[PDB]
Amino acid sequence: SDLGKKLLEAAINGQLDEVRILMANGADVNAADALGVTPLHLAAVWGHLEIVEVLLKAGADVNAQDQHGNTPLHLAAWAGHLEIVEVLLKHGADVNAQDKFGKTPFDLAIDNGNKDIAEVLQKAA
Amino acid sequence: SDLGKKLLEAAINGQLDEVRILMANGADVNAADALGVTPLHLAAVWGHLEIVEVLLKAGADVNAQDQHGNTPLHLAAWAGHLEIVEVLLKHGADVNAQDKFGKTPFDLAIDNGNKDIAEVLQKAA
Amino acid sequence: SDEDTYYLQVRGRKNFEILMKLKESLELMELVPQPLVDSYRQQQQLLQ
Amino acid sequence: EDTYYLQVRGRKNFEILMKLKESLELMELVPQPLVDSYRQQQQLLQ
Amino acid sequence: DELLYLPVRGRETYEMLLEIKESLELMQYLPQHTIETYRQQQQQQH
Amino acid sequence: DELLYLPVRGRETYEMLLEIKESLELMQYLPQHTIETYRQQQQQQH
């Protein structure tokens, strides 16, 4: 039973209790699928604040990059999850991290009309 | 883009003229596709008597086998082409040739209600 | 198993043209001589 | 991007086209950044 | 008509792509007539 | 659920299988609820 895949599936599906029990049985919070996508990425994009927090607390890399150079901050910004953006900045998310098309989290926020989030990222400079 | 390929295409499509011209430009009548299927197989299953005859005259293997051990006789019998069956027997088609499931041309004839053809194959023993 | 006809709908033009191209090959499958189907399948499992 | 209708002979054909209709339509709900990440890996595996 | 190698994650998808691949690859064994007959049956269907 | 390599004869076929493979492979990135929502929306049109 490989706990990497199980933890990624749980992050996507917002299964807080499932995530907690997988970590306690030794799951790697920095487990990445074929595309370099981590549980922190997936919890961030699907708007699972509590799960984002347990993973960060458990030492989840805050500026982990997938194939595309998407960080959790990129995906939260993309997805319009302000509360999650705020936490990532707190845990030291690179505001200036660039995806492979040179988009910053700020740019992704703008492109999808997340003005509140863009204002936060501009001032978090 | 292959002479082999072009001749298989012509056999399927009953293009007698085309088959004659491809052979005269040095097409191989024993050309087989990925599955070991030959022009004689394809002319036989699609009921192209005249094309069957030009290929046999031009030295086509009468008991050529595909991946499955299908001979031209198998496919003629399957397809209900009595005139073509008769010619293949004349040119020495193995009545007892077995596909990989141990089915004979006789068996395939019966299973599809080609009684006239089955009667011929039973007696051609 | 019934030879009955089913309807389905699909959002977006490009999705339609993909499903049609497949509807075609899938429906035309029925007209391919069984012996050549079996010859194909026995070589698919030979490449497993 | 309106709605198009199509018909199909035979149950097994229908259940295949439905399974595909599903993934194709559900495509629109997959975050672009993960799509971009997938495509950038497809290039390098071809 | 080379033998190309398509990368696939998981059986569900492999098995599903295999089924489809089969219908596509097996149409080389149909007369041009038979296919045209069918597309005329479909354009006369729209 | 490892990366399997599917043999394909023909580019037209490979290219066609590639399009489809994308939609199927990318559904791994959707929550269970999102798919159920969609199938419930499809049960409605039986």
Residue numbers in the entry:
A (entry chain F), B (entry chain E): 2 to 126
C (entry chain B): 350 to 397
D (entry chain D): 352 to 397
E (entry chain A), F (entry chain C): 359 to 404
Copy out sentences from the published article reporting this entry, exactly as the authors wrote them:
All members of the p53 family form tetramers in their active state through a dedicated oligomerization domain that structurally assembles as a dimer of dimers. In contrast, p63 and p73 form hetero-oligomers of all possible stoichiometries, with the hetero-tetramer built from a p63 dimer and a p73 dimer being thermodynamically more stable than the two homo-tetramers. Here we report the generation and characterization of Designed Ankyrin Repeat Proteins (DARPins) that bind with high affinity and selectivity to the p632/p732 hetero-tetramer. DARPins are small kDa proteins consisting of multiple stacked helical hairpin units in which certain positions can be randomized to select tight binders for a folded target domain.
For a structural understanding of the interaction and the selectivity, we solved the X-ray crystal structures of complexes of both DARPins with the p632/p732 hetero-tetramer stabilized by mutations, thus the same DARPins that were used for the in vitro selection. The combination of an E363K mutation in the p73 OD and a K377E mutation in the p63 OD thus selectively stabilizes the p632/p732 hetero-tetramer. Of these DARPin F11 represents a DARPin with three internal helical repeats and DARPin A2 a DARPin with only two internal helical repeats, always flanked by an N- and C-capping repeat. Titration with the DARPins yielded dissociation constants of KD = 10 nM for DARPin F11 and KD = 17 nM for DARPin A2 and a 2:1 (DARPin : hetero-tetramer) stoichiometry, while a control DARPin did not bind at all. We also measured binding to the two homo-tetrameric ODs of p63 and p73 by ITC but could not detect any binding, demonstrating that the interaction of both DARPins with the hetero-tetramer is not only highly affine but also highly specific. A detailed structural analysis further revealed that both DARPins bound to the hinge region between the first and the second helix of both p63 and p73 ODs. D The same as in (C) but with DARPin A2. This DARPin shows an even higher selectivity for the p632/p732 hetero-tetramer with additional resonances representing less than 10% of the population. The analysis of the DARPin–hetero-tetramer crystal structures revealed that the C-termini of both DARPins within the complex were pointing into the same direction, which enables the efficient dimerization of the DARPins via a leucine zipper for increasing the avidity. During the expression time of the p73 peak a strong pulldown signal using the DARPin A2 was detected that was not present at times in the absence of p73 expression, while a control DARPin did not show binding at any time point.
